[PDB]
């Protein structure tokens, strides 16, 4: 179908823009006492989980649109939202302005992950 081909390009393109790695902050006896580490650890922990979920969902959609895995109920719900351009409710994990569409969320989500990577990189290389 026409939608099946168009959605395949969009999902593959989104996997290019969205980053792929997010390393959790290493908890340390003196890092727990640091308030900045405590807040920043939450950001990556909730950020890493959201990053993996979106990438896995997008990869399944690409594989579905290549006719390699069968469409499940979750995929049917996700694919319907992506065709209509509505941001999936599963992806919605941080507060966003009302009326934000899926194309803006992917670009917004990609920027947030980059900042999350830099924060973890500083903690990994240099310390908290």
């Amino acid at each position: 179908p026409a939608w099946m081909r168009t959605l395949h390009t969009t999902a593959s393109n989104w996997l290019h823009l969205i980053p792929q790695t997010l390393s959790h902050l290493k908890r340390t006896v003196e890092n727990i006492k640091d308030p900045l580490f405590r807040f920043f650890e939450r950001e990556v922990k909730m950020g890493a989980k959201l990053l993996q979920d979106v990438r896995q969902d997008l990869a399944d959609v690409v594989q579905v649109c290549e006719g390699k895995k069968k469409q499940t109920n979750y995929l049917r719900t996700l694919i319907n939202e992506l065709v209509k351009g509505i941001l999936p409710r599963s992806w919605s994990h941080y507060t966003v302005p009302a009326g934000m569409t899926v194309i803006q969320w992917v670009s917004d989500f990609s920027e947030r992950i980059k900042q999350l990577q830099n924060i973890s990189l500083a903690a990994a290389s240099g310390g908290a």
């Binding site: 727990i32 006492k33 308030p35 405590r38 909730m46 499940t72 109920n73 049917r76």
Partner: protein
Amino acid sequence: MALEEFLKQIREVWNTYELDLVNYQNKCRLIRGWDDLFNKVKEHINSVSAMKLSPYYKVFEEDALSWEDKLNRIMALFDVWIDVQRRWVYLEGIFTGSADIKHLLPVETQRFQSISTEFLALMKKVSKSPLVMDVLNIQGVQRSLERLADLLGKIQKALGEYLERERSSFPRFYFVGDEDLLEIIGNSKNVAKLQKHFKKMFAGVSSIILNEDNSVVLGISSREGEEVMFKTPVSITEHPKINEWLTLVEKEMRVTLAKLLAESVTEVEIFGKATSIDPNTYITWIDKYQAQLVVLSAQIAWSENVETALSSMGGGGDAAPLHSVLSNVEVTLNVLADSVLMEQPPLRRRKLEHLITELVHQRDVTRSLIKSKIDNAKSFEWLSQMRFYFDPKQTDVLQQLSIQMANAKFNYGFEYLGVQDKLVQTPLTDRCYLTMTQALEARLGGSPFGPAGTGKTESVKALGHQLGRFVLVFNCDETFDFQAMGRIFVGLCQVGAWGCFDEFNRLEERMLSAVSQQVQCIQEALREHSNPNYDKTSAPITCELLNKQVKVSPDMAIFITMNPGYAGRSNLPDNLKKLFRSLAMTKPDRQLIAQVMLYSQGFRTAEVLANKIVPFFKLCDEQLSSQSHYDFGLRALKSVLVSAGNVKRERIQKIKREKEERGEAVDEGEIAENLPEQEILIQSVCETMVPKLVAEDIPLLFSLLSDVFPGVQYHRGEMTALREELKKVCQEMYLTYGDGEEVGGMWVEKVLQLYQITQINHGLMMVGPSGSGKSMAWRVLLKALERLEGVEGVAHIIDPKAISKDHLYGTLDPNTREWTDGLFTHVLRKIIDSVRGELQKRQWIVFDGDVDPEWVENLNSVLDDNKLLTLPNGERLSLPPNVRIMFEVQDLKYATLATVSRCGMVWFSEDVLSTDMIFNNFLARLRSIPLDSPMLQIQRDAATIMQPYFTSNGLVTKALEHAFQLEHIMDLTRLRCLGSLFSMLHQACRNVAQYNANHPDFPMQIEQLERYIQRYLVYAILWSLSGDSRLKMRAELGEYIRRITTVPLPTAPNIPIIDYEVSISGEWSPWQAKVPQIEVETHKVAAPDVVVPTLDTVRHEALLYTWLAEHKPLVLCGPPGSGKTMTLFSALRALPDMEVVGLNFSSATTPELLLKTFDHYCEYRRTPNGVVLAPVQLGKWLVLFCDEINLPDMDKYGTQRVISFIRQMVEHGGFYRTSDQTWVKLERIQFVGACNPPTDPGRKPLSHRFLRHVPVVYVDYPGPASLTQIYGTFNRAMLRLIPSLRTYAEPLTAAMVEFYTMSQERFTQDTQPHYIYSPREMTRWVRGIFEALRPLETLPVEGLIRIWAHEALRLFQDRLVEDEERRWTDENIDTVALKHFPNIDREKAMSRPILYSNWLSKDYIPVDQEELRDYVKARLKVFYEEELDVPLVLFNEVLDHVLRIDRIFRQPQGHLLLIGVSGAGKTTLSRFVAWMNGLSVYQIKVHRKYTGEDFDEDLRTVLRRSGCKNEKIAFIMDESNVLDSGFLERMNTLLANGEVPGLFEGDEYATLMTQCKEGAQKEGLMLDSHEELYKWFTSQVIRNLHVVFTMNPSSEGLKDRAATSPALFNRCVLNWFGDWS
């Protein structure tokens, strides 16, 4: 002979014990001593039960069993007698003390007289022989009381209108339930029984003080013991009737308080504007007067001082005496602060806390007045303050006190409030007071709105208590309709009470609009009071409520509190909103509340503590991880602050307790000097916040604690006494107990944490994933507290989502307005009534199930400080202190903040329950509980063999970890695997015992026993961990086990381990040895009961046998048609003494479908231990087979009601009977589920709490080789009819498999929802050819291909929607046939018009199209003259269609799903073919008023004709005939099972049995049993009733249709007629 002594003692006790009799008003001799009777009977019942365990019980077994019967009969009699005597007492009082009721209800009055005669006659017999045994032997005494109880209940329910008349005479009765009101009215002479009801009619009156005679009411008392002595006592003798002296008591309460206020104001004025206050005099004045008057007196004195000071400052430049007003407050507050620094009586200490809170506000207001340089009494900064003016010269004592805020003026209601905890008077609370009093002056309602936990409800009550008003809180829901709200208004208006309706937007929008009319008319009446022209000596103000003229007291008010941010709530219509003044309460002043509360409790560093605790809660909400069960709001802060005062008091008591045994240096002042106040606060935080934390947040919060409270350490009390009892309870329950880091230590900490929450909260939640030890944590704690404290613990476990919300809380009758209690309301009311001493026991109500806002928000007033269950009938049930409300849940993803903030949280993680602990529990039970000691000896030896593999990091642990990495058809949980694994190992122990039965000479030795168990364990591990996965995943777990295990394994090179069983000789044996190549009898070809043995069938049957033989619930999952029903029924044949009953779930399936099955196959019987539900047939285990267990609709909160109901019956072994709110225990009932994979459309994932009990086996479609083996066997048998066609068996099977596989790939559910191809089509394919070959003596091979091609078109092409799809099927039938059948004449075998009919001959042989057309025209001519004179044009598609319909009408259970455009002839052709086959046509005669019970009666008519009269019927029904979804729930059962379990009930079933007996007699069958008759009736419906369903093609409708009626797509043959081409 110790047993003989017990029998002698039991015999001697009951040979002398007499019913203790008391005369009752010279009418009879009632029975007291119910506690003595019941405990004595229970004690002997336990002793008789306990002595059975003794080995010497055999000699005295008969005598003990005789006493067990007698003691049980004593219990059953006097448990009814007590309720009968109680009900007769107050009914006799009503039907004697009110002669008006005889005329009002003559029938009831005469009926009560007859019952009152039989009661008194039975009383006189008891008087003659008060011995219990003599009473127990009275003829029919058990049945006499049973009739008396039922008859007295009918009289009780017939007095409702009489009770509504008495409620007017004392309007506080409007807030009392009907039964309690009858107790009040009927016991008007027995005043001691009235005490428990005063808390319902009064704000703070818990009891009344009476003289020795009980004839004069001396005063009133509160629940805390505070007493008010009336100045003029009320005599009950001079005013005998209940509603007049109750009115006089209500008036004297107001008059005495006003007189007491005047005396208090006189004394407190000396303290005001005084330089120095002596503490002894001030404490004396506090102790002399009531708590409400003490604070009121302080407010009056302060107001008059400010008025006096501001009056002197009229010149402006005059010196300010306001500083003296501040000075007096400073001095008085210092004395109050000093008093609370030392020990005080509990009542005085609370009074001091109230005064400190009041004066801190007065200090703040006076400071604000001084800072703003206010010098005039008419300045608004003073007028905006709440002021208190007292006129001693006023003649009416009730109007001496005036409370004024801005322009609003109020009288004090002088309702006795007792000792109500006061709020800290914060700026938000000040703004709340100003706004609400402005609404009250405008005669408008108050509408505080905001998020949860901001003080909305408490502020409304605080303002009401400030004004001395009776404030009633109602927890509103959707059941608060127009009639319910109006009746509540009637009570509020006449009493003069304030109505605070919380969660007011939970009403339906239509009800909110309707209620606005009642609110408006009351408000207009309220303005009539405010009119100066109106005079008090005139006609009372009255408004019209519920079409009645109701007097309105000026003191009444209406308040609504709502969270406008909650989604799903009802929007208030504007006309309702204009009647209320709204105020936003969003940000409570937490630091001020914390500072004042800690300062009032006696903390010297309250300012330091408040500046730390409030930011600490803010930090926790942000620094800690985000969890749904996390709350750090004002309720959490309030809980810690209140707990801080309790912890401070216990330490002071502990410090001096150490001082008693160490010297005599009690120096209380110095004791408070060296008191670790910060450490006290940390203990309260940790006792309340820590149990809710996940593991990774625990170190975070302690780092935060060290950040805000440096150098302060938390140390739990080492609770040796409780831990010792817990350790013993764990041993008796086969549980693992640990201490610290030992095995089970984490779980024991959670048990101790749960105990701490029980002591601080009356409502608490245990939250954690399924299998976290939550249930065992509170079940063990309940038993441990019984042993530790001596208090019996009782748990009522409720599944709230297994029943409707109507059945949980109750319903108000739409017409009679009668209230029926729900399950929770009945349980709580039983505890409050305390007929059998429920108030002396620990009562835990555990809601084990899903939490959603729809039902749990009815408990908002229960879980908060109100502790009240409010019902729409106006009744309010107080939570007794011995009751805990508990919620055991797996998640809180749908609970709102309102619920989470109101409950103590104990979080369980899956790490709390370690896999080692579960292994220990299974092994401990295996070594102690016999499965049938020779059986226990086998288990014990087997336990030793299994022990090495069940250690941590053992074989099972490593296998479990690897299994979670694999893919499973359902979500994988640890306990589903282990539950399956332990069931299989129990069967292995039974196998060894069964072997010993077969070999009585040589029982299995340890070497053989060891050799068997290790291989069976490996076998059990594979099926328990991969039986729900595909073959590739089952294989992969095999190699992983092969690497890590040391158990010997099969040495085959490429054969998976899952392909091997374990023989009883401890040898691996291939499963292929049990798969013979059978030859099937030629008449059983593709019959429904015939199973061709394959590798999968023998393995699945053996696995099903193990689970079924253990009565373990199980689910078969697989694609539709994969053999789940076939495998289950095949396994049941090898398992006799088990009856299967098939239930077909739909999207609309509720638990009521299960209940109808119980009504037909099972009986409810009363046993001494409760109601037991068991199958009617004895010695049989009844199996409920649910075919679509995962179709039932999931609500918006992720819950399937029937699934919760099944989980309750499996895990709790029963359910609640909603008619009488009685627990029913299941016996000999097991459950088997079948379903499609949850990823399929319409299918929902099963709850993890249900899956832990239910092992899942995955049944896939047979592969190409398995299909060749199955239907190659069938084809060989069916081709023995024609010996000349034997050679073509293999090519015929190969063509069948090839085309079926191609069609299954070509057409899928993605294209159309009904494109499901399964081996069911293969079975129909072979059957169809076989039916066309039986009457044939010979046939050429080309004739065989034509039948093969014809059946392929009927099975694969008739459901296709598109012409391209039908073209592909037509072409590939030719391609497949010639590929497997060369050297055949294509034209004679594959001529495209393939038509078969038995209309032109005796046999089903091919028919020419033109010959068929002439025959149909000839028959249509007759059809016009006999049935329907509607001429039809005959085209080619009609001829094919009528042949297709004719085929289905000639098959048993032949159901049709005709899909096409309206007006295409679907109904007409069906009737025409039905007339050709002798089938009667039944169509339901719908109309605008045709309802569900019309459809049920129509269903009964068709079933009687086809089931009893042997009448072949074509039941033709269109989609338009479906006027309700309930129509198809009946048809879904009828299509699949040929029966509807609940259709025939009562007289209909009795008439059906008479007709079935007559019908079976005409057939020559010998049937007399009702069960035998019903089975024959079902078999007749199966063979005679044909259902034709016609519907238009709708893509959305067709897909949705599958869930509503799955039988339409797997029990009906679908023919896509579509539109005319």
